[PDB]
């Protein structure tokens, strides 16, 4: 559905490219849509509150501070996102239960896996300016990702 | 047969979690059992001795110094560990012939792949305290691993 | 066809081993042949030039300077490599459109993936001495690689 390479050829400099630090973990090889940013650290309470809303055509971009000590997303939360039609999740942190994640019809990009789950006190901020992988994100921007990489741009692409 | 994420939910602080530095090279997605520690470096003679014994319900945890210059395990040694029913191998170092290892009914977690094989003089220690990936291992401890990660239950 | 571990057991110090910094992106597990080198940086013009020539029994060793900001090889270019029968490509740089490359009957070893394609000015040097991954590659040498690693040999370890 989304070929980031071709998109890069077409839109050239009008698109930002994320450093190659991520890999697919979800059941979808590629995905994209309008983003909603979240800023948290080893706590996915907010992620739950946000994924509780419908997300068709939307991608959750999580600035998890890059922590690989706690997984922000696991099978349950991923199932909630699928429940509410989210296109995908981009976690600047880690995921969990990878085997099960590969079976969920949703895109998931993260830096690594770790068996320990994050807390759920819901601390953090949503819809704020976040930056990671040498890229600044804002709710409203549009992101596209596939097995080759991840790109961000203000306007939708297609 | 094992789910490290689930176990972490159950045991929490009661189990240690190895830093996310390993990859899966064996035919088994998950494996686990009581461990036997081995310390050595770019030499696997000792491993031959150990794997020659039965390993049902056991996992061999090899502190290979994290060397990615020599492979401590290859198709031959892995088929031996399989022959002796070893649950799996966790190598803090490198493995070889990954294409063959993927087809073997045994767990294998290692740092990387390297075509050059390890020597077989036999130097090294067995049943010793080893530390890597921010975790210390002791023979008798119980290890569990899958595609999500590796955890160690201190016995 | 090629088992670099076995080759290492047989040839020992007569073969060189590249640092384990590469991953398989092609549809071919193992490959090998005489090498043609290329020194460039975020510009695949020369690669297209060289891949135009028949590459049966040949492997294109590309010193892309280790950049992962620009991909030197994509579906288009890899297809050309296939059509002209190249054995495989070893890119000390980035590749692109991975899902396409995994399907092509050619060996592809690269540092990583990145959606931004490289330029095509054609800047760079062909068939020159290049060094990366702790190994120096000379035009004419022989390279063999598989999922465990990549090794270099002065003389042929295979046929032709």
Swiss-Prot record, chain A:
CDD domains: RraA_family (cd16841). It comes from Escherichia coli (strain K12). This is Regulator of ribonuclease activity A. Globally modulates RNA abundance by binding to RNase E (Rne) and regulating its endonucleolytic activity. Can modulate Rne action in a substrate-dependent manner by altering the composition of the degradosome. Modulates RNA-binding and helicase activities of the degradosome. Keywords: Cytoplasm. GO terms for molecular function: endoribonuclease inhibitor activity; enzyme binding; identical protein binding; ribonuclease inhibitor activity. NCBIfam families: NOT-MenG, PRK09372.1, RraA_entero. Induction: Induced upon entry into stationary phase, in a RpoS-dependent manner. Stability of the rraA transcript is Rne dependent, suggesting the existence of a feedback mechanism in the regulation of RraA level. The keyword Cytoplasm applies. Belongs to the RraA family. GO terms for cellular component: cytosol; protein-containing complex. It is found in: Cytoplasm. Homotrimer. Forms a ring-like structure with a central cavity. Binds to both RNA-binding sites in the C-terminal region of Rne and to RhlB.
């Amino acid at each position: 559905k989304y070929d980031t390479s071709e998109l890069c050829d077409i839109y050239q400099e009008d698109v930002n490219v994320v450093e190659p630090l991520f890999s697919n973990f979800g059941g979808r090889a590629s995905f994209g849509g309008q983003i909603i940013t979240v800023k948290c650290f080893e706590d996915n309470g907010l992620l739950y509150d946000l994924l509780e809303q419908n997300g068709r055509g939307r991608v959750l971009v999580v600035d998890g501070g890059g922590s690989v000590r706690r997984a922000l997303v696991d099978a349950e939360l991923a199932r909630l996102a699928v429940q509410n039609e989210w296109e995908g999740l981009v976690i600047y942190g880690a995921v969990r239960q990878v085997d099960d994640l590969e079976e969920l019809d949703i895109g998931i990009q993260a830096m690594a896996a770790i068996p320990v789950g994050a807390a759920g006190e819901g601390i953090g901020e949503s819809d704020v300016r976040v930056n990671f992988g040498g890229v600044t994100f804002f709710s409203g921007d549009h992101l596209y990702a596939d097995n080759t990489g991840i790109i961000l741009s203000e306007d939708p692409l297609d």
